[PDB]
């Protein structure tokens, strides 16, 4: 045997264990009403991103946090969109619209950092982007902010594809 | 609503009695009945680190026989058979010196699928401040991997020291409780916490026993592979 073991107590609290890269962005507490009582279920809004150009979001509901957590985990794993970065930032200024939520994204010089806050900051970090100017011009619901932010980033046009189509020279004037 | 005790509902049909004796008179029917409760309670409360799953008592006009199944009999046995003699003296004092005691510590097979040590292990985790969700989930997963049917654990009480009492259940599989032919083992334990008392209830399903006999054969006692 001689499993050694001296000093310390038990299993303390080590943990690590992760991949790709994520972070909880909201944990709401939804409930329905039945014939006596209230069925209460936790809802989580997880943002999954590899910090290199792959990012997805997943919202899930379950009777307990661990369950709903891993549900949203797999959920984002499934719906992952592809993101392209230019010098670490966003290429052109864009306004993302989703319902009554409008998110303004603006290119930033290398150094300013992520000037975002809330759902947008999580998305920008999880996407890979560094320097980014943002302002939330609408509502403060995390799900709609994520919807608006992703819509703005997915409608982005590459400096290459435009001229290709446009029959111009790569990026040349 | 209220449910009939699962062990008590299956007595006389598929499960035998833990104590099998016939007394002389209604005065000796009470002494021989209280004494065994003391003996069984003694075994279970103290000498607990052994995982004693069930102790049966067998008495005749004057001869008392004890059959004790445990998962770790080293603590009963002690250092070169010490604690065993010690425990023997307790039992003799309880029943009386005029009789003959015949302890028969038997090692147990398939320790997992016994509702006593599982409930005891669940109860032990709660006194050690272990988080309830983690403790319950870890015990169930080892139990499910051990190769049995569904297990239902109900842990009602002032959960996590709360001031409002709750109750958490966790079913995992087909546990037909209304069925008599099933081999369902039931046990109950009192986790004594600094904030009060916790009631843990464990229902375990160990297959289907079409046998019309009452035990008459080791149940989880059997040692399979």
């Amino acid at each position: 045997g001689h499993n050694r073991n001296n000093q310390n107590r038990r299993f303390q609290k080590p943990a690590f264990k992760s991949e790709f890269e994520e972070r909880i962005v909201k944990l709401k507490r939804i409930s329905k009403t039945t014939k006596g009582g209230r069925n209460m279920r936790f809802s989580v809004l997880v943002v999954v991103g590899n910090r290199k150009g792959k990012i997805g979001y997943g919202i899930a509901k379950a009777l307990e946090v661990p369950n709903a957590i891993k549900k949203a985990i797999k959920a984002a794993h499934n719906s992952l969109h592809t993101i392209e970065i230019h010098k670490g930032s966003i290429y052109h200024e864009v306004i993302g619209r989703s319902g009554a939520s409008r998110v303004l994204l603006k290119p930033a010089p290398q150094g300013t950092g992520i000037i975002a806050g809330g759902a947008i900051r999580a998305i920008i970090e999880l996407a890979g982007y560094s320097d980014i100017y943002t302002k939330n011009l609408g509502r403060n619901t995390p799900i709609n902010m994520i919807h608006a932010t992703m819509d703005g980033i997915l409608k982005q046009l590459s400096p290459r594809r435009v001229a290709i189509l446009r029959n111009k020279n790569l990026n040349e004037l | 609503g209220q449910k009939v005790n699962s062990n008590g509902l299956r007595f006389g049909i598929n499960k035998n009695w833990i104590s099998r004796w016939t007394a002389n008179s209604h005065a000796q029917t009470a002494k021989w009945l209280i004494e065994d409760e003391k003996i069984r309670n003694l075994f279970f409360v103290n000498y607990r680190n052994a995982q004693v799953s069930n102790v049966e008592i067998e008495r005749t006009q004057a001869t008392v026989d004890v059959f004790v199944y445990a998962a770790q009999p080293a603590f009963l046995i002690g250092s070169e058979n010490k604690n065993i003699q010690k425990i023997t003296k307790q039992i003799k004092q309880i029943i009386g010196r005029t009789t003959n005691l015949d302890l028969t510590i038997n090692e147990i097979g398939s320790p997992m699928l016994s509702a006593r040590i599982i409930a005891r292990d669940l109860a032990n985790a709660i006194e050690a401040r272990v988080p309830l969700r983690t403790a319950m989930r870890q015990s169930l997963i080892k139990v499910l991997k051990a190769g049995a049917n569904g297990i239902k654990v109900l842990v009602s009480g002032r959960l996590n020291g709360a001031e409002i009492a709750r109750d958490k259940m966790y079913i995992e599989g087909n546990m037909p409780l209304s069925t008599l032919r099933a081999d369902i083992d039931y046990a109950l334990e009192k986790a004594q916490t600094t904030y009060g008392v916790i009631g843990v209830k464990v229902w375990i399903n160990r297959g289907m026993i079409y046998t019309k006999g009452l035990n008459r054969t080791p149940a989880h006692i059997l040692h399979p592979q």
Binding site: - | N5, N7, G8, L9, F11, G12, I13, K15, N16, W17, I18, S19, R20, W21, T22, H26, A27, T29, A30, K31, L33, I34, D36, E37, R40
Partner: protein, 60 residues
């Protein structure tokens, strides 16, 4: 005041009619089964655990 009543019941009285029967596990005085020396609510735990030989549920 239960244990003292239990102890006094165990002790013999000075008159025969002074002797009553209490439950032997707990100390309940009323609803005691002389057939078993066990009160009605201790009989459930013993009957539901198999400690009492032959005590099975009844169907009629």
């Amino acid at each position: 005041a239960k244990k003292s009543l239990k102890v006094k019941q165990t002790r013999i009285p000075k008159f025969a009619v002074r002797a009553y029967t209490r439950c032997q596990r707990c100390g309940r005085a009323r609803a005691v089964l002389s057939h078993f020396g066990v009160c009605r609510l201790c009989f459930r735990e013993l009957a539901y655990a198999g400690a009492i030989p032959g005590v099975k549920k009844a169907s009629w």
